Design a protein around this ligand. Structure first.
Ligand SMILES: C[C@H](N)CNc1cnc(C(N)=O)c(-c2cc3ccccc3[nH]2)n1
Length: 266
C-alpha cells in the first residue's frame, strides 16, 4: 500500500486537489490520478482504508498512498473525468449509451452493497469515465464500512452534506444505508439523463426537503425513456423498507439495457 515518491511523476496541471501523474509499476508505467492533501490526514487515510478493501471493475482502484510534500492517494486514472462534466460537453451521447453507463454504476453499487459499505456521496460528479462506454465509481471520502450487526451508519452531527442527493431518513434520522445510496442513485440517473444538469434547480436544501415531504419529485428529463424515469421514481421511495436495494435496481437496468440493445439490432 505504501508507494515510493521517486517512482511517481506529477503533472503541474490540476484536474480538480486532484492531479495527473505516472507511476512506475513492476514493469509498465501506469497513468494515475492523485488526490493531494495540500483530522484532514485521518480523512484521506480513511478513504484509502475503504478503497483498499474494494475490488470491482466498476469502482476506481487505489494504487496506494504516499507521504511526501503532502499525503497523496494514488488511483488508477479515469481519463475522461467526471460523468456530469462529460455529458455537459457531449450532448450527442445517446440514450442507449447513458443506460449502459448507469447500469455499470448499478453493478458497482450492487457490489458495494454486497460488501456492506455505504458510499454516502453517490452523485454524477463521483462517477468517472475510463471511456465513453466504461464508468467507475470514485470518491469514497464519506464512505463507511457497516458494523457486522447493523445495516446502517448513524452520523453523529449534520455536517457539510450533499443534501440534494440524500434520502429523507438521512435528513430526518441521520441513518445511511445501501438503500439511502439507492435514493442517491435515482438522483444520479436524473443527472445522467439530464446531461449533467444539477438536480432541484434553483432550490435551497430546505425547499428540497419540503418538496419531497409533500410527495413531489423531479419531472422526467427530455428524451428520457419512461422505464428509466419509473426506475428513478422507485429509487425515490420515501419509506426505506419499501425502497429497492441495488440487486433489484441492477436487475431492472440490466433487462432494460438488453431490450434497448435488441431494439438497436432491429
Ligand atoms: C470530480 C471528481 N469527483 C474528483 N475526484 C476524482 C477522483 N478520481 C479521479 C480519477 N481517478 O481519475 C478523478 C478525475 C478527475 C478528472 C478530471 C478530468 C480528467 C480526468 C479526471 N479524473 N477525480
Amino acid at each position: 500500500v505504501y508507494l515510493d515518491r521517486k517512482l511517481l511523476t506529477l503533472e503541474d496541471k490540476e484536474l480538480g486537489t486532484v492531479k495527473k501523474g505516472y507511476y512506475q509499476m513492476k514493469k509498465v508505467v501506469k497513468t494515475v490520478a492523485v488526490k493531494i492533501l495540500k483530522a484532514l490526514k485521518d480523512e484521506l487515510l480513511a478513504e484509502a482504508n475503504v478503497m483498499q478493501q474494494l475490488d470491482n471493475p466498476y469502482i476506481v482502484r487505489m494504487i496506494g498512498i504516499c507521504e511526501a510534500e503532502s499525503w497523496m492517494l494514488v488511483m488508477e486514472m479515469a481519463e475522461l473525468g467526471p460523468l456530469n462534466k462529460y455529458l455537459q460537453q457531449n450532448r450527442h451521447v445517446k440514450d442507449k449509451n447513458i443506460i449502459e453507463l448507469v447500469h455499470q454504476v448499478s453493478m458497482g453499487m450492487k457490489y458495494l452493497e454486497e460488501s456492506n459499505f455505504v458510499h454516502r456521496d453517490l452523485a454524477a460528479r463521483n462517477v468517472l469515465l475510463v471511456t465513453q462506454h466504461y464508468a467507475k465509481i470514485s470518491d469514497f471520502g464519506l464512505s463507511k464500512a457497516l458494523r457486522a450487526d447493523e445495516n446502517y451508519y448513524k452520523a453523529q452531527t449534520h455536517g457539510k452534506w450533499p443534501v440534494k442527493w440524500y434520502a429523507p431518513e438521512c435528513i430526518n434520522y441521520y441513518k445511511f444505508s445501501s438503500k439511502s445510496d439507492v435514493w442517491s442513485f435515482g438522483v444520479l440517473m436524473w443527472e445522467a439523463f439530464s446531461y449533467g444538469q444539477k438536480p432541484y434547480r434553483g432550490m435551497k436544501g430546505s425547499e428540497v426537503t419540503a418538496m419531497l415531504e409533500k410527495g413531489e419529485r423531479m419531472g422526467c428529463p427530455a428524451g428520457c425513456p419512461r422505464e428509466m424515469y419509473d426506475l428513478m421514481n422507485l429509487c425515490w421511495t420515501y419509506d426505506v423498507e419499501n425502497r429497492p436495494g441495488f440487486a433489484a435496481v441492477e436487475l431492472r437496468l440490466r433487462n432494460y439495457y438488453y431490450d434497448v440493445v435488441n431494439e438497436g439490432h432491429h
